[PDB]
Swiss-Prot record:
Present with 91800 molecules/cell in log phase SD medium. It comes from Saccharomyces cerevisiae (strain ATCC 204508 / S288c). The chain holds residues 5 to 213 of 2051 of the full protein. Coiled coil: none annotated. Fatty acid synthetase catalyzes the formation of long-chain fatty acids from acetyl-CoA, malonyl-CoA and NADPH. The beta subunit contains domains for: [acyl-carrier-protein] acetyltransferase and malonyltransferase, S-acyl fatty acid synthase thioesterase, enoyl-[acyl-carrier-protein] reductase, and 3-hydroxypalmitoyl-[acyl-carrier-protein] dehydratase. This is Fatty acid synthase subunit beta. The gene is FAS1. Belongs to the fungal fatty acid synthetase subunit beta family. [Alpha(6)beta(6)] hexamers of two multifunctional subunits (alpha and beta).
Length: 206
């Protein structure tokens, strides 16, 4: 037995067919989620709000994932995450959907990045890593030999604001590259400490 749970932000709306066993926990999460959510505006042009039903559901996923601390809301997180995947990820990855919203729908870059963050954070938090091998067309072609891949890594002079790109990586993919960035920070600090004159070069620290 399952029943509808309607969540909307302005004209756009969505329905989760949650089971009756966790309907109460889902409903209270809905109530406090709507309380947290900012009020709708015409066109959804204001920042930090959804613009499409996909964006709204993904915001709810990210919010529930933040509230989850790896059992209280794990079942509802898994249920609504599966609903989101079934309705919007028709076998495709999150980034293809993100590009689709960016192109077809009136979605901004920050909203798309925040949707991606919410989905990935929910996926990792709900004991659902990406251990399953992906079926990307490019890598399938590589496996069958139809395409060849050469990685190229950039360097200096590409941009004057590379740190904003580091910041967007740490933000959007915090759960993924957080271990990498923490490891890099600690080893860089250790290298500065061990090096004789590194502190002099690093006036503002690292």
């Amino acid at each position: 037995s399952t029943r509808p749970l309607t969540l909307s932000h302005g004209s756009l709306e969505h329905v989760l067919l949650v089971p009756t066993a966790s309907f109460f926990i889902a409903s209270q999460l809905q109530e406090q989620f709507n309380k947290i959510l900012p009020e709708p505006t015409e066109g959804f042009a204001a920042d930090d709000e959804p613009t499409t039903p996909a964006e709204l559901v993904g915001k709810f996923l990210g919010y529930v994932s933040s509230l989850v601390e790896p059992g209280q809301f794990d079942q509802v997180l898994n249920l609504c995450l599966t609903e989101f995947e079934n309705c919007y990820l028709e076998g495709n990855d999150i980034h293809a959907l993100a590009a689709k919203l960016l192109q077809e729908n009136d979605t901004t870059l920050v909203k798309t990045k925040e949707l991606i963050k919410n989905y990935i954070t929910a996926r990792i938090m709900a004991k659902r890593p990406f251990d399953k091998k992906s079926n990307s067309a490019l890598f399938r072609a590589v496996g069958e030999g139809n395409a060849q891949l050469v990685a190229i890594f950039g360097g200096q002079g590409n941009t004057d604001d590379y740190f904003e790109e580091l910041r967007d990586l740490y933000q959007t993919y915090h759960v993924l590259v957080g271990d990498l960035i923490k490891f890099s920070a600690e080893t860089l600090s250790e290298l500065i400490r061990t090096t004789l004159d590194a502190e002099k070069v690093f006036t503002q620290g690292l």
